[PDB]
Amino acid sequence: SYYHHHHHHDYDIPTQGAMGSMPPRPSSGELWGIHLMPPRILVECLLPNGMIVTLECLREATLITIKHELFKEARKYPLHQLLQDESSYIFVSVTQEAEREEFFDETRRLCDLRLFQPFLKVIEPVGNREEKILNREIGFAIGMPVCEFDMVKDPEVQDFRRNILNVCKEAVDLRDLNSPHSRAMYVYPPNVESSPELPKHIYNKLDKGQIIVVIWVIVSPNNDKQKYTLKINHDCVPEQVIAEAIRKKTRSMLLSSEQLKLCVLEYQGKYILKVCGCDEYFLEKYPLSQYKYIRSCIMLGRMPNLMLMAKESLYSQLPMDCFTMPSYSTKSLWVINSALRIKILCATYVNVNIRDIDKIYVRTGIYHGGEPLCDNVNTQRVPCSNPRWNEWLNYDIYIPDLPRAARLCLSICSVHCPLAWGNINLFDYTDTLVSGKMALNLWPVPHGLEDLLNPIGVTGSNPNKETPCLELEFDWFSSVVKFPDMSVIEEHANWSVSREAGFSYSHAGLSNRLARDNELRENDKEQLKAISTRDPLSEITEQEKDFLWSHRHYCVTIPEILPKLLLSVKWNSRDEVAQMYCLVKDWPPIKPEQAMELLDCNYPDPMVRGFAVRCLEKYLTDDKLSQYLIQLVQVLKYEQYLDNLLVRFLLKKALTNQRIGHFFFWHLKSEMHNKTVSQRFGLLLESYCRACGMYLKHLNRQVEAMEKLINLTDILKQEKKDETQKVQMKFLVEQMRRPDFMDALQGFLSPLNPAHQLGNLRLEECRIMSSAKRPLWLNWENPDIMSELLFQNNEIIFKNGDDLRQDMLTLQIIRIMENIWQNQGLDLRMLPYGCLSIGDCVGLIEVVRNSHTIMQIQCKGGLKGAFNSHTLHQWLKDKNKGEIYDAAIDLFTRSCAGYCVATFILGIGDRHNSNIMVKDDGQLFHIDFGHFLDHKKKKKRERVPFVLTQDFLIVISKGAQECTKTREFERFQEMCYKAYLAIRQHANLFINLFSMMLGSGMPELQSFDDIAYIRKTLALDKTEQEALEYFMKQMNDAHHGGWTT
Template sequence: MPPRPSSGELWGMHLMPPSILVDCLLPNGMILTLECLREATLITVKHELFKEARKYPLYHLLQEESSYIFVSVTQEAEREEFYDETRRLCDLRLFQAFLKVIEPVGNREEKILNREIGFAIGMPICEFELVKDSEVQDFRRNILNVCKEAVDLRDSNGPHSRALYVYPPNVESSAELPRHIYNKLDKGNVNLGIYVRTGIYHGGEQLCDNVNTQRVPCSNPRWNEWLNYDMYIPDIPRAARLCLSICSVKGRKGAKEEHCPLAWGNINLFDYTHTLVAGKMALNLWPVPHGLEDLLNPIGVTGSNPNKETPCLELEFDHFSCPVKFPDMTTIEDHSNRLARDNPVTDSDNDQLRQVCNRDPLSEITEQEKDFLWRHRHDCVNMPEILPKILLAVKWNSRDESVCACFSFQMYCLLKDWPAIKPEQAMELLDCNFPDPMIREFAVKCLEKYLTDDKLSQYLIQLVQVLKYEQYLDNPLARFLLKKALTNQRIGHFFFWHLKSEMHNKTVSQRFGLLLESYCRACGMYLKHLSRQVEAMEKLINLTDLLKQEKKDEAQKRPLWLNWENPDMMSELLFQNNEIIFKNGDDLRQDMLTLQIIRIMENIWQNQGLDLRMLPYGCLSIGDCVGLIEVVRNSHTIMQIQCKGGLKGALQFNSHTLHQWLKDKNKGEMYDQAIDLFTRSCAGYCVATFILGIGDRHNSNIMVKDDGQLFHIDFGHFLDHKKKKFGYKRERVPFVLTQDFLIVISKGTQECTKTREFERFQEMCYKAYLAIRQHANLFINLFSMMLGSGMPELQSFDDIAYIRKTLALDKSEQEALDYFMKQMNDAHHGGWTTKMDWIFHTIRQHAMN
């Protein structure tokens, strides 16, 4: 790993002394000991060293000091050459205080660049060079052309285009048990064995029956058997993959056997040159992810685990007299044209097609409907948005001419003439259900045609995640994102951090690391800014790790509240300080996703003329359970406000405390503005938290600004994964709408539900709910694209089905509105249960403090 920056520690010890003794070995064989300040830069040390060397023999053998650099061994046990002589001694993390002076060999600029890139992405570039995989090396070579095109485009119009890149306009829009243990397990009646389960899949679709090896004892995991599949080689689709897992089977006499996956792996049956896999190979397997319900993981990554200490399967595929290649497009077109047939379409057929087209992505399509869609596929060109449904009708494992042969070949030809679809629809074709490279290429072409930079920034989290579903390293989506990142610095900034934040994940570290290397090589001077950002984050990680060691109580979980001074002279017109919360130990990916969805909801409402004044504050995950959160100025939690109302307010006996606080903060005309702002934002968050199933809504994670704007924080539970007590859900209302909020909305009236203000609030909620329901497919697709992220509360399509439920997609619009009205009625009538939860939360917080 590249050296991590130091916060002033000496060789692993904190609180480095002001000065240290450093032994220096010169090229003439002399060893000199210098007393150096801990803050001394390498150029200062070198200057002092050569000044001292003049007093010793053999000085005449030395060249100019500028001809040399320092080299040493770091705490990671790696030899490092220090080309950047502005670095301080305290930041080098040396194993011992020893520096050797050498003449640099090779291209100095290239070595400096490689070191900076390695430091920025968290992986030495030399690791890529050591990978003996032709796909990796071909990708590194070919992707440079993509970078060059993007850089040429970025610099095509001189200073103007470079200014647009830096400042893009922001337009609103031992396997065998010991015998003494074995004999104690139910008197030795437990039978343990392992076997390999295999299957051929296309995305998540099983193409033929799964095949298992024979069971063998754990002490001798050898199978030495050939497995045959009920599938002909000509029927294998291009994106097919062989999925494998080592499984254990445990059983007691007279009891049902228990099967459990131990490790898994996937192999593309066609490699990146479109050649069918053949011969022997070794596949290092991956650990089983949390929440995996099946024995196989077909939507997991393909390829071998780079960690060679993991379980390894030795495989052998059939050899043929010559390589078997997937047909090229010319062969596909010739074959498909001979088989194409036309079916006349009637008005009732058109109605049925539109009815299927209007279904949400999670609704089931019957086999009869799939056959119907396929028969009328050519007529659907005038209904381009139906494409995902037609693709689900393709029988990827069949080329039997008696059933309208060569489904996949004909689909490829159909895609050539298919009109481009909207970006929000095209993104559905990038999730795990559509692994075929030509389908994904079509989707990327639609994005290239219609997706603006603002929209790309909005959906960037998902587009980075679906890179995990790409079959090969070099793919159209990776090229598209890389070009965009290199022509818009704002996109490039978040593209870098979304990739960097997952470099600890070994399943994608190679894929993401190669993309990061390509971006860093082409982003120019911005690489130095990224390196500074990485260095700052690493120092904060070091600091928080030290604090955790020092504090063993609840305080160690608290984040750092940082106040950054803005050096810009114009900052006096805005804010002179920026406040950021740094968290080390919490997974912020779920917060980041929820805030993104709320931001998209707000855009939809604004486009429909509904201003609900949401506040999706900034949140960025930058690593494994590490991230940054924007501090919202002049804001207070509901609990803080209630506690200002004395004991009655803190214990929820006085529901007027929040209204009185707002009234004190906003005098005169500002009072009406504050009530309006509170009403709008409360309506928006009621709808958003209900649809997303946001849980753990206590009075410490709902906040109000001085001007009346309400917003929610801390989205650790969503999609109805709410906290439970003794097996029961602690929150018994669909969303938070307490008497405190209703009194503010009705301007202090006790009978708040009978006021005109409350009716206006209800109307806002109804309009907001129906507006989001009209865009249900977009939100389902956005969550589906995140299934590969590994978030604990987003593991399967069953989790996403909760959005189908809250949006009532199986009902008519009026029925859905009636359903939401009932939920709203339950919310404000059950508000007393929320207040009970708040009482216990407040008591607990006071006891902890």
Template sequence: MPPRPSSGELWGIHLMPPRIFVDCLLPNGMILTLECLREATLITIKHELFKEARKHPLHHLLQEETSYIFVSVTQEAEREEFYDETRRLCDLRLFQPFLKVIEPVGNREEKILNREIGFAIGMPVCEFDLVKDPEVQDFRRNILNVCKDAVDLRDAGGPHSRALYHCPLAWGNVNLFDYTHTLVSGKMALNLWPVPHGLEDLLNPIGVTVTHLLGRHNHINMTIQNVLLQSNRLARDNVLMDSDLEQLRLVCNRDPLSEITEQEKDFLWRHRHYCVNIPEILPKILLAVKWNSRDEVAQMYYLLKEWPAIKPEQAMELLDCNYPDPMIRDFAVRCLEKYLTDDKLSQYLIQLVQVLKYEQYLDNPLVRFLLKKALTNQRIGHFFFWHLKSEMHNKTVSQRFGLLLESYCRACGMYLKHLSRQVEAMEKLINLTDILKQEKKDETQKSIILFFPIFPFLRLEECRIMSSAKRPLWLNWENPDIMSELLFQNNEMIFKNGDDLRQDMLTLQIIRIMESIWQNQGLDLRMLPYGCLSIGDCVGLIEVVRNSHTIMQIQCKGGLKGALQFNSHTLHQWLKDKNKGEMYDLAIDLFTRSCAGYCVATFILGIGDRHNSNIMVKDDGQLFHIDFGHFLDHKKKKFGYKRERVPFVLTQDFLIVISKGSQECTKTREFERFQEMCYKAYLAIRQHANLFINLFSMMLGSGMPELQSFDDIAYIRKTLALDKTEQEALDYFMKQMNDAHHGGWTTKMDWIFHTIRQHALN
């Protein structure tokens, strides 16, 4: 998609003036000039125009005003008919303030739908009509059947089922302990109650904990954690020699980046039929195939028909750039269809959208799978839309993603209007930030006052323009939910225009997955992967975490000594002041757990540029990191040397909090407990190393500056010590932790200079 010639409300103008003269050409040949308000709707303009026309000659030639619509030329050099007369003049993106009045011809509904789709996806639908490529034409025709099947499935239950698609309308509560005081476990079916009026989309914690007795309403099947005892016995016949079987397992357990020798490939191919009993070895078998041999490829295709389905996390490896064969990718998608839940799909959606770039054809099983899921689950559909929309500026994928967006928008029903409103709001924010980058500081407030009335829920006194060069907006608006008094009365987010947030979004996703793994293994490390969404070329949204402060802000509250790192007790004292009595112990525990989690996560991912402005602490003690502009050891350098000389941040300030104010921090029981948490967390992630390598491999086509090749991903192999035994890997991590807290003084020096620089800039 070519870049827009102008991002303003008129050609070359970011924002229209409050009043503007518009030339209007009537069907009777008269041209009238109206002075219109910037926010005037088309129906208002048309009413005023026809009232004015009655004062001029030839007005008797005009029909009723409802018989006409406006048409004009937009900034994309497209002739656009405006059927939606509730649109405002400033939202039309006109080339010049000129409107022509015509009688509409053709299918009104189809034209309205095409306009809404074109606006939502960022390119006119008519551009697809002009493409003569038979593959594009067949895809547009055939994919409609996929959409129809998905919509029919969604609507099969009648009006009640359609309502559930937009808003879940049932609730249920379960006691964690039954009447014998035994912890509930295993599978159970919970019949749900219909939600009382006024409680849509909210939890109902005060509701009863009994299941719906009649069972005529919706129900969910749920599993409460079962304890599974692992057996060391193999449940397979020993068809091979023990040594051969052991070698197969060793090859199977290797990470995706490890090399396989030619001898090992021959060994795998010889025993390929037995390998059906080890389904997870499939990626290694595929690497052993000689793809230039017709016979071997045919045998592999035959073997795939017998191969058992593999777990989704393993199947996703078959969708990256190493496996372009359509039969392999079809097998992988069938595994996803069989085992991948909607929750897991939401977790991995970023990667699954990216690997669409590796598909040979427009119409493929992965496209159909994702489209069906997006149309039957609105939450998935929402992020599916934005992950595609955010790359529409990329010419290499704009046609592929544009066709997919068109298909989704045609089938998503009334949700298209919500998406269009979101796109329009983002366009307005882009215009505003473009102005703020150009305006002088004392003029920015005037611009913001002119602009903000289009968002009636904004709390202007709480909104601000942040100090960085890209002029991000801190937005605060009232929560329109009728039950907001029980939750939060306002929402906050940061809008950024000029920063690539894809790397932040990926890092936060990985942290979210790490937390899920830890929780499954009984480790509650209280991570805080806040929301972050890239919505366009260097444009995105970031969730604001409530009641949180940067380490630098906290240290500066401790006076000059705290700001210059001379007093390492400032953070501990601040937490102590915020949390009295029993809350103090809870705050220290929360800080310790979250600090352990982020120490492990930032070390494994090689997160760089860690200073006291991008590490934050909540009032309740929860620590979290922000701003992930550097990862995989791409750390900032000064005069050719890396500025950060420790594996991860573990300063004296943190150790004092963990040890509850003790001077000899590392000799306390609290510090030993902290170390144990870190060791367990590290080994837990190491057990899932293949998953993280696969997730990063699937993102190689994203074009992120710091994720360009498998060499970048190899850093994860290094930090997880995948070429060592588990004990050797643990020893390696223990050494890194020792280096981190003994080298904390170097981090403190960096923080001193960062604090001085920030105060100088402000």
């Protein structure tokens, strides 16, 4: 009666949903095929004398421990007289990367070697320079051995490797410029806000611009440390604060006024300011307020805690960076008088149902992001099985009208749906036009791409051999055909202009023709800047394009129009292109936040991207770089060749600054699993690691720590599923006590922030969470001298099996909306906690102490019997009592306003009790954002995801009933409206960041209409007065009443 007795016969009884919460796998661990080598294993020791003696070993046993036992045991075997002293030998074996690593560091333990089969060969040290074969260091940090690059064919790869060393040396030379000061300046750069200018609400916490500080000092042996409690102007500098603190330290009843002054000078310069609790320093003359540490302390109602530290106890700690060069040290295109044609030959390895599909063909096009000619196909010949076409494809474009960065984009298709795809660059890295025969391995159609051809997709062949390999042939013109020099493209511009000045006025009915020569209309001159203001994502009309293209010379007045102009150039018309090249040559720089558009996938020309780098070189502070670092590392993908100006810029700034370095390492190492970019990023990470000085050692210790945790959780998730937490926890603690873990997981730097150190592992506070992703709550002793002043314990969550980078980006976007708002003078306090992806669905998330899901607030405050709308509000009163309560509601109201807007604008996941968090002091913040740009609409919602229940509203309006109608809530509303328009005026940036992210294979960002959601939500097609009303409309329906005027 329920199911109309309708049987499903297919439904099998066993069979995913059953524990469906841990997607990404797999890997091999400490030995081939197995995660964790048996505690006691036997290994075969191939001697030089030919004898295989099979040592029973412990998994954690060090190589010297093994050798010393091997050579004791080889006395008992035959041919002993043939062996040297044990000291004249090194170990060697085959690894899981299938190279033959020599094991020089005989402290290393057997499980940590990444062996393949448990066997070790004995040999004598090959190469007098052992020193040189600590590339394995680099190989470990990168996670693929350097010897793998040496035997690469490609001259580009080889050219990049040797050419890029230019950069490495230029930054290392800056590091030893004022050594030891500059070396410290690399290692511990000043952690500063962007502007010294202070927002009013920060200032008003200052009683006429002053702060009480605490400068600590140590004497003998150490231990008794002594507070010196200054009260100095906010905008005074460190060298002044160090004087005042010495003044105070060294006033006395046995020292005259003068005698002190002369003591102060000799003492003043021998010290510097450290933050207590972490390795941060105040190394150059910034107004004190401007360091991040202070400005937080102000905002948090905290008294800063610095430390006088001698320069020789800091120049103690910096070892030498000491860089070494490695062991690895025509006829103009415009002459060609033909059109383009490309010969398709055969596609070999296509996997299709002959029963389901009729016919298969090759679609093809030329591109620049958008395309230089009518797109073609070929005839639907030898369909499905046996599929070949021997066809010259005929492209309506002359060969001189290909732009430097021209690209063929092709795909095999069915009838209409694509099977595979792959894109080639019509030129090579040495300017040379592609000719002859090319074998293109293809890429599988992604989730988001329904479109036939995929021209945003990555340039070059898939390395994965067993895929559709579609081979093809390019026309040959009896020489390497090279692209024009710039001296020649210049000349042809200076002609294209001189010729343009002698056409008839009858001809000015062309409309791409600025007949308003130097004088122009005021309506025109205004309608141009009206374009300028428009976001990147508003499509431009042929009329506007032409209108721009003609007036291009007035467009230098508005530098900011350049992106719109560049898209208005006919890149299929080498006259137009050679001219645009000549504008771009000396076009006024622009703001990075605008110049970063020019590095996205719609501007692939190298002249353009150059102008864009040049902008960064001027206007981009090292603060603002690490802010946008993700979007820059991402945008490398969109470069045509390995060696280019952006890679050199980033490589240099990273070797200039070890904080940028740090994240620049991980953001590359993060994406190393992805074969789109393994080669590119692999090579770049070689150069970084080769030139970064001692940080290569620090990275390796982090790198090794992450691997322990990867192997550990990979086990927990596979063999140990279907066991009690009790069982798993008893297995996790068993494991972490092993000395190889204890070595590998203790003294090292938080990859979330290398300022924090990690030191001892507190195992009783270490545990697995409930989640079936089996995340480890890991907890470290902050080993700082003044741990007690900052946090005695550091604790951060390692989560195997979850793609962190959506979260990563939303947090970064929030972090930006905050900085935007707070310089605007609207204090809304978001808490964008740390998140770092270190791999393929592997990452780190910062723990915010003293915070709970609304749900625990309601479980803890839940009455015995069958929760209360007030319980949140009652739990918050419970904490904050007095005039503390009044200001704690201000915090909840300030955060809760901003988090409403960010959430609405981004369109992050639906919020509820178990992903909304409230802190003791009363700040609210969101966690686990999931799909960010409204990725469940693929199955015009303009959704409101943060919908403020009674719970929140009560708390917003102290304790009232009919909260809807308080001033408390009138204030809150005004916060939301001011925040929303704030972000609407910076929407060019948020679009641009999201554009720059299409590079990563996040399914939420496959192409621009994904991003277009953030137009509607900000209502950019409207005017701000309707925007407001749209937002108010939007917010009103979700809440069921509240929002007008």
